């Protein structure tokens, strides 16, 4: 195990379309799937899972190629990866809709499943990432405060494995910078926590998988230009950080173009990493929203 599993939960694997996916699962009741993003694994949910599993069955997979999950066999575009996550969730909730919570590139890798299988998704929570569309081409490369929060899109998408070549052997240093520069509340990223995430992403296939998501980003944008012709109809909630590193008001504003029924919150004093930087208010908002079902 790359990360400690919380009490009452089990680490397990399921093959989906030939790809072995790792997940952690616990609880009883209707299913909620929690999907992590870049720089992290299922473990970013380890503080939400205890309370959430008192009311729901909770499954937190590792994205293909990240954590302990095998890379995808089709590709890394959102529409390709969403197939794996959808079939995984439906293995555990085949006759009933399930809930979805996603963070960062977890959004990219689930939005196509949601729009294409709307009857399978009871309620939806998206936090801290743009849905891939042309609005991402407007984020600035550089700012009057210096280093921007989005230059990594181009670094990671660069050809000839530029990012792996520079970061290999320096994974712990790079990840600490990347995480803390996107955070308002940096203290929660302890030495030990950063060691655990660094060791996981330092696996050569996971370092490369990480950046293949960004190398498929423009393909995902083109896919979503067609998919977004159907608006989402299920109750949705967006969360974004209001501090340094977060999406601020962009998150809810963009989602209004995708979802008929959306409520949004901007969490003060939090950056990009909501489950770790403000576990307490984020957990309450998510649990309350999902418990309306």
């Amino acid at each position: 195990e790359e990360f400690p599993v919380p009490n009452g939960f089990e680490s397990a694997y399921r093959e989906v379309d030939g790809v072995k996916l790792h997940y952690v699962k616990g609880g009883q009741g209707p299913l909620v799937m929690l999907v992590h993003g870049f720089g992290q694994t299922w473990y970013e949910w380890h503080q939400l899972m205890p309370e959430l599993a008192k009311r729901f069955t909770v499954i937190a997979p590792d994205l293909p190629g990240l954590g302990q999950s095998e890379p995808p066999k089709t590709g890394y575009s959102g529409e390709q990866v969403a197939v794996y996550l959808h079939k995984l969730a439906r293995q555990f909730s085949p006759d009933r809709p399930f809930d979805l919570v996603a963070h960062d590139i977890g959004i990219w890798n689930t939005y196509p499943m949601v729009v294409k299988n709307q009857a399978d998704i009871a309620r939806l929570v998206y936090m801290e990432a743009p849905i891939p569309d042309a609005r991402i081409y407007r984020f600035p490369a550089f700012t009057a405060q210096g280093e921007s929060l989005v230059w990594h899109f181009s670094f990671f998408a660069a050809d000839d494995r530029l990012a792996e070549t520079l970061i290999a052997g320096k994974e712990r240093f790079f990840l600490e910078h990347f995480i803390k520069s996107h955070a308002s509340n940096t203290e929660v990223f302890s030495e030990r926590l950063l060691d655990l995430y660094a060791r996981s992403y330092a696996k050569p296939h996971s370092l490369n998988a990480s950046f293949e998501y960004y190398r498929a980003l423009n393909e995902s944008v083109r896919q979503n230009a067609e998919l977004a012709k159907t608006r989402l109809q299920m109750p949705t909630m967006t969360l974004a950080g209001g501090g340094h590193g977060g999406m601020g008001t962009f998150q809810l504003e963009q989602m209004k173009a995708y979802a008929e029924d959306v409520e949004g919150h901007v969490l003060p004093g939090c950056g990009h990493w909501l489950p770790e930087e403000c576990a307490a208010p984020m957990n309450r908002l998510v649990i309350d929203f999902l418990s309306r079902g």
Partner: nanobody
Amino acid sequence: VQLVESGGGLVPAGGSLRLSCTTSERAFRSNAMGWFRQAPGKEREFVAAVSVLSWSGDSAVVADSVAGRFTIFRDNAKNTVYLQMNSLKPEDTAVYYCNGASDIGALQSGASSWSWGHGTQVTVSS
């Protein structure tokens, strides 16, 4: 908050000063940072503010009374926000105070994330 406000001085009109406001990292990153000023017996007034950095970028505002003369900028590495004051006038004399809020609009509306500090005294002589 570890608030430190400095840089004020006795300076002749037409001169310049740079004020500095430093706080703890969490306070600085959680808030749009603003400079205010208050002359004794008068209202505190908003001077300038700079938002936190989001993925879309940032924003900054300088009040009309000092636009073209004062500028504001963050040094995120030092958890410090600076007020560059050029072409000072006697009417700029005041104690200058630093504070923060959830966004620039909240600072303009009077919100503050910490109790006001001692400020830094700016005296513009003849």
